[PDB]
Design an enzyme around this catalytic site. Structure first.
Site, mmCIF file in Angstrom:
data_model
loop_
_atom_site.group_PDB
_atom_site.id
_atom_site.type_symbol
_atom_site.label_atom_id
_atom_site.label_comp_id
_atom_site.label_asym_id
_atom_site.label_seq_id
_atom_site.Cartn_x
_atom_site.Cartn_y
_atom_site.Cartn_z
ATOM 1 C CG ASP A 5 -1.645 1.323 1.390
ATOM 2 O OD1 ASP A 5 -1.845 2.050 0.393
ATOM 3 O OD2 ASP A 5 -1.998 1.641 2.544
ATOM 4 N NE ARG A 39 0.229 6.712 9.613
ATOM 5 C CZ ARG A 39 -0.973 6.742 10.172
ATOM 6 N NH1 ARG A 39 -2.008 7.297 9.563
ATOM 7 N NH2 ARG A 39 -1.139 6.208 11.378
ATOM 8 C CG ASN A 40 1.294 3.181 4.186
ATOM 9 O OD1 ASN A 40 0.690 3.710 5.118
ATOM 10 N ND2 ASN A 40 0.699 2.383 3.310
ATOM 11 C CG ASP A 47 4.560 0.402 1.195
ATOM 12 O OD1 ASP A 47 5.602 1.073 1.040
ATOM 13 O OD2 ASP A 47 3.672 0.314 0.323
#
Ligand SMILES: *C[C@@H](C)C(=O)Nc1ccc(-c2c(-c3ccc(Oc4nccc(C)n4)cc3)c3c(N)ncnc3n2C)cc1
Ligand SMILES: *C[C@@H](C)C(=O)Nc1ccc(-c2c(-c3ccc(Oc4nccc(C)n4)cc3)c3c(N)ncnc3n2C)cc1
Lengths: 276, 268
Positions: B145, B149-150, B163
């Protein structure tokens, strides 16, 4: 497991209501807030028992998961702690012990605001300017109260506002996308603040004074944000005053800093209502 | 074995993560660096769910072996130790002091940290992330993903990817992964284009004002996101190349790192 809670952790407050007097009925409203169902409880008011009283029951959907039950219970506790106000769908009971979870809340005899106004247009009970101002002031006062309790609205608009037999405007959803309703900063950053709620209330007033009108008609969603950043706001409703439209536009101010707080709005609307 | 870490140093503290990837948690190890004798270092522990099932106990160890084989890279959230044998499984991974990317930029915009980002800084972040993605592509690595945010930012302002696995965020998935349900590196290039977009807009939601329900059919119409204000015609053309309707014609990550190096050298 299930919502009958074979090994889940409930508690037992005073708010509990005997499930032996509750009778569930027809689904009410498309359940974005949850599985709501009309009901005819008995003796909820505590001062007029045996009198049948209509209410709305929030229950779990058929394929609800554990997190849905947790959200429902936390929503119940939030409604408990929020307090009482005349311009809000208030909590008045719950069934949590020895059976499924049912949250019993206030019921409005007349539909949502959109269809109410639409069915009271001059093409009965015609809506005159004073009725519109009184309605707007009502739910603005409710909005201020909800602002005190650090509440943010999921989707504030006419179809999510109810009206009771006494013509009392009550706000719901104080907790798909209503892009046509949210402010540019909420479209872009996807963050919702009391200022974004002020913009949403501006759109709400527009919807009131146009008697249930669709916002931004003919403008596609893909274009909407851009047009909003250009400074294009909705035009003045037909039967509306320059001051109320200026109020709407101030609610739609490009920068959240200059938008008027809900108390400012309540004061201005009270002054306008003072002159009938 | 060599990666084993003593159990007398870890802590629970804050979750430091909202799901996905694992049950991340805060921790403060002591003397983890061989060069630093004893000074404590804050770290993140990837611990197993309370409902330890048959596959999770294997999945966490699969992630461990993943990080062991992948290696070290500056722009990657790297494994630096773990507590495996004779106790519960605690996987010690790098820690980002300044938080995720989205909030990092969102808090450094012109009118929260009082250091605005420069277009210099945005190009540097994009170059860093492309340099990380090219390495992850060198290994048969898959991004689960890819979003703002990641992606994390350390106190040194280093972009780190958080990720990746081994052989829904609809606004980030490519049309072939959305409609044809096929995953390739080209879909990763599309996701990197969306990441570029939300970088140069300083933490903006892709397709603002567009709900997903209409987004599907809008994509099928050929609708791509508009140019950011802080973006240049060249970098916007880059983003739009990452969003090429034909995956085979999208630019490889190595081309991206080369181009970003070319632009970054300017004014420096
Ligand atoms: C998605 C959107 C188009 C929509 O249809 N919303 C919607 C659903 C249900 C009603 C409704 C309600 C009603 C509203 C809200 C709750 O639960 C609740 N109340 C306050 C705060 C929170 C977090 N949740 C329950 C029911 C009523 C009621 N209570 N009485 C009469 N008629 C109602 N309608 C139509 C409205 C809009
Ligand atoms: C689900 C989505 C909305 C989200 O919030 N993802 C998310 C989770 C955790 C953090 C995070 C982390 C962090 C990220 C990833 C891992 O595990 C991992 N790292 C590398 C490679 C693989 C296969 N797995 C652990 C932790 C950290 C850290 N390490 N330090 C500081 N702050 C952190 N955050 C917020 C971010 C986004």
């Amino acid at each position: 497991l299930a919502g009958v809670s074979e090994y889940e952790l409930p508690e037992d407050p005073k708010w509990e209501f005997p499930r032996d007097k509750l009778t569930l009925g027809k689904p009410l409203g498309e359940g974005c807030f949850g599985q709501v169902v009309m009901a005819e409880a008995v003796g909820i008011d505590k001062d007029k028992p045996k009198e049948a009283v209509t209410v709305a029951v929030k229950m779990l959907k058929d394929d609800a998961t554990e997190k849905d039950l947790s959200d429902l219970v936390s929503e119940m506790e939030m409604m408990k702690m929020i307090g009482k106000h005349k311009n809000i769908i208030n909590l008045l009971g719950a069934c949590t012990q020895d059976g499924p979870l049912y949250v019993i809340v206030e019921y409005a005899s007349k539909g949502n605001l959109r269809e109410y106004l639409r069915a009271r247009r001059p093409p009965e009970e015609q809506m005159t300017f004073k009725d519109l101002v009184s309605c707007t002031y009502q739910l603005a006062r409710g909005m201020e109260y909800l602002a005190s309790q650090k509440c943010i609205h999921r989707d504030l608009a006419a179809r999510n506002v109810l009206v009771t037999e006494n013509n009392v405007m009550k706000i719901a959803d104080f907790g798909r996308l209503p892009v046509k309703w949210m402010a540019p900063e909420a479209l872009f950053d996807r963050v919702y603040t009391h200022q974004s709620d002020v913009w949403s209330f501006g759109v709400l007033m527009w919807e009131i004074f146009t008697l249930g009108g669709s916002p931004y008609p003919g403008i596609p969603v893909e274009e909407l944000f851009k047009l909003l950043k250009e400074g294009h706001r909705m035009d003045k409703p037909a039967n509306c005053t320059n001051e109320l439209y200026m109020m709407m536009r101030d609610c739609w101010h490009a920068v959240p800093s200059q938008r008027p707080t809900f108390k400012q709005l309540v004061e201005d609307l009270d002054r306008i209502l003072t002159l009938t």
